[PDB]
Amino acid sequence: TEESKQRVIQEYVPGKQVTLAHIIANPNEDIYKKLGLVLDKKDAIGILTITPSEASIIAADVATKASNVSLGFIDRFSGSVVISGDVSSVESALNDVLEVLGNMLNFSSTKITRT
Amino acid sequence: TEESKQRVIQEYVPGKQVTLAHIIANPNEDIYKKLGLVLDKKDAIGILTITPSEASIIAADVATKASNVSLGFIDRFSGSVVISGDVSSVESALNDVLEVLGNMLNFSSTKITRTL
Amino acid sequence: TEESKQRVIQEYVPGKQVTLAHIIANPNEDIYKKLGLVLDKKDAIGILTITPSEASIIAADVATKASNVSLGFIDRFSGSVVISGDVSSVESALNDVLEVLGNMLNFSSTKITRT
Amino acid sequence: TEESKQRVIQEYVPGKQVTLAHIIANPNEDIYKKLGLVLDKKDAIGILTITPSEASIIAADVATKASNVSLGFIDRFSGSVVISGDVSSVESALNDVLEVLGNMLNFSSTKITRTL
Amino acid sequence: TEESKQRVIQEYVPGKQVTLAHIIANPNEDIYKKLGLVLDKKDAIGILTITPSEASIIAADVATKASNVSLGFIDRFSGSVVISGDVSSVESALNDVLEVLGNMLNFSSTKITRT
Amino acid sequence: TEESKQRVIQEYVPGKQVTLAHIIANPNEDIYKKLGLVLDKKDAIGILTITPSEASIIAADVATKASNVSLGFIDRFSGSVVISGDVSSVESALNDVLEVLGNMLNFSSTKITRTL
C-alpha cells in the first residue's frame, strides 16, 4: 500500500566507476556494422562503460595514446567508448584506461573481461 | 511534510544485470513490424534487457554467433537486444548470453522465460 | 548542509513491474488524437505502464493474441502500451497481460482500474 | 573516499503520484506562447505533474470531460498535462483528476495550489 | 561482489525543490550566445533549477510578473528557467519565485547566490 | 525473489556537486575533433562534470573570464563544460570554478586531476 512505504529524498549525482572493460576478439560483422564501425576481419573491439559520462573523453584519449587502437566511437552523453585494433593493442589500451581512471582518479574499477 | 523527509545523496552507477531473457514463439505481425523486424512466420523472437547498456554489444555478438539466429536489433543506448530464428536456436542463443554475462562476467541474471 | 548528508552508491537496474493497467471506456477525442490513435466512437482504450521497457513487447503480443484489440502503440523505450477495442476485449487483453507478466514472469503487478 | 561508501542495488520502478496540481489565473503571454498555447486573456491554466507518465492520459481525459476546459497539451513521456479555461472550471477539472488518480487509483496526491 | 549487495525496489517520483537561484551580473558573451540569449552588455541573468520540471512554468510566470525581466528560456523538460534584466530586477524576480515555490508551495528552497 | 525486496519511494532532486575537473595536456586530435573542438596543438583541455546541469552556465562563465581560456562547449542539459587553452590557464580556470561552486555555493567538490 501507498501508505506503508517509506519516502526519502534522494539527491542524485553521478558516481565515479568503470563498470565494464571488455574485449571481443572476433566480433560478428552484423554487430559492428550496426555500431557504425569499419574494421578488418582481424580486428578486436574493446568496450568501456564509464560514469560520469564526461570521463569517456579521458578514457578515449588515454586509450589512443596507449597503443595502436582506433577510436570506434565516443559517446559523451552515456559514457561509452568503443575502440578497435589487434587484441594485444586493445588489451594495453584498456589496461591504461583502468590504471588512469581506477588508480589515478580513484574511480571504482573492474578487471578486463573477454568473450 | 517536506520537513519530515530524510535526505540522502545517491551516487548513481549502472548495475550489472540481465533482467529479462524472453522467448515469444509466434509473434504477432503487427508487433514485430512495429519493431522493424522482417521474419518468417515460423520464427520466434528473443528479447533481452541488459544493464549496463554497452553490454548489449557483448550479448548481441554472443547470440548471433549461435547457429540459425539473426540479429533483430541492438540498442546500445537502452541495452535492448532482440534476436530471431527457430525457437530452439533462439533459446540456445539466449542461454549462451546468460552464460557469458551471468557466469563469466558475474552479472545478476535471470532464467529464460517464454510466452506459453 | 552538504556536510550532514549520508552518501551511498546506488547501482541502478530496472525493476519488474506492471504499474498501471487501466481502461478508459469512452475516451475524449482530443486526447486520443493527440496520442495518434484512430478509433471508433465506441472504442475503449487500455493503458499499460511496464518496467523493464522491453517487456512492452511481451505485453503487446499477449494482448493482441488474447482478444480482438488493436495495438494503438508500443513504446519500447518507455514501456508504454496502449490498445483499443470494445471494453470487454480490452479487459480480457489486460487480464491476460497481467497473468503472463505478473503470475508467470513474477513481475510486481496491479489490478485492472477503470475511469 | 571511494572505499568508505555503502553500495546498494536499486531496482527502479515508477511511483504513483500527482506531485503538482497548480492554477495560474492570468498567465503571462510570453510564457504561454512558449508552451504552444492559444488562450483568451481571461483564461487560466492548470498544470499537472504525474508519475507514471502514462497516467497523463487518464488525467487529460478526466480533465477535458470537464465543462468549459480545453486541453493545452499532454506529454505522455514526461507525464505533464496543461489545461486551460476559466479559473473555476480549471480548478474543477484539477479536482476531478485528483479524485480519480488519488482516491480511486490510490496515487499519492497533493492539494490544488494557485499563484496568488 | 554481486552476492554481497542489498537490493531494494525504489519507486521514483519527482521531489519539490528549487536547487539553484543564481545571478550572473555580467555574463560572458560567448556563454549567453551559446544559450540562445540576446542581451544588452548591461544585462544580468538569473538561473533557476526546479523539480518537478513543470514548476518551471510557475516560476517563469512569477518572475515575469514580479519585475522587468525578460524570459530567456523555459525548459519544461528539465525545469530550467533563465531570465535577464538589470541586477535589481533579476534579484526581485528570483526572490518572488522563491517566496511562491518555497513558502507558498512548500518546495525545498535555497538562498539567492551571485557570481 | 520479488516477494523479499524492500520497497521505498524515492523523491529525486539534483545534488550539488562538481564530480570531475580534469586537465588533458595534449589531447589526441581524433578525440578533440569528435568533440567539435578546434585547438592549437599546444592547447590543453579542461573537462567539468557538474550537477545540477544549469550550474554549467555558472562554471562556463567563471572559466571563460579566465585569461587565455576559450569555451569548448557547454551542455546545459548534461552539465558538461569543456574549455581550452595553455595548460596553466586551463588549471587556473578550473580552480576558479571549484572556488565559486565549491566554496561559495557549497557544492561538493573534487580536486583537479590531470592525465600525466
Author numbering:
A (entry chain B), C (entry chain B), E (entry chain B): 2 to 116
B (entry chain A), D (entry chain A), F (entry chain A): 2 to 117
Paper excerpt:
To understand the structure and function of the C. difficile eut bacterial microcompartment we have determined the crystal structures of two proteins with homology to BMC shell proteins, CD1908 and CD1918, and show that they are well conserved between species. We have also determined the atomic structure of CD1925, a member of the EutQ family of cupin barrels. The sequestration of ethanolamine metabolism within a BMC is thought to protect the cell from the acetaldehyde produced as an intermediate in its breakdown and to prevent the loss of this volatile compound and its carbon from the cell.
The structure of CD1908 was determined by molecular replacement to 1.51 Å resolution. The protein forms a hexamer with pairs of molecules related by the crystallographic 3-fold axis. A glycerol molecule from the crystallisation condition was found associated with each chain. The N-terminal face of CD1908 has distinct patterns of positive charge on the surface, with a shallow depression at the centre of the oligomer that is approximately 10 Å in diameter and blocked by Glu11. The opposite face of the protein has a distinct conical cavity that is 25 Å wide at its widest point and has Glu11 at its apex. The role that CD1908 may play in the structure of the BMC shell is not clear; unlike EutS, which is able to form enclosed compartments when over-expressed alone in E. coli, CD1908 and its homologue PduU form no higher order structures.
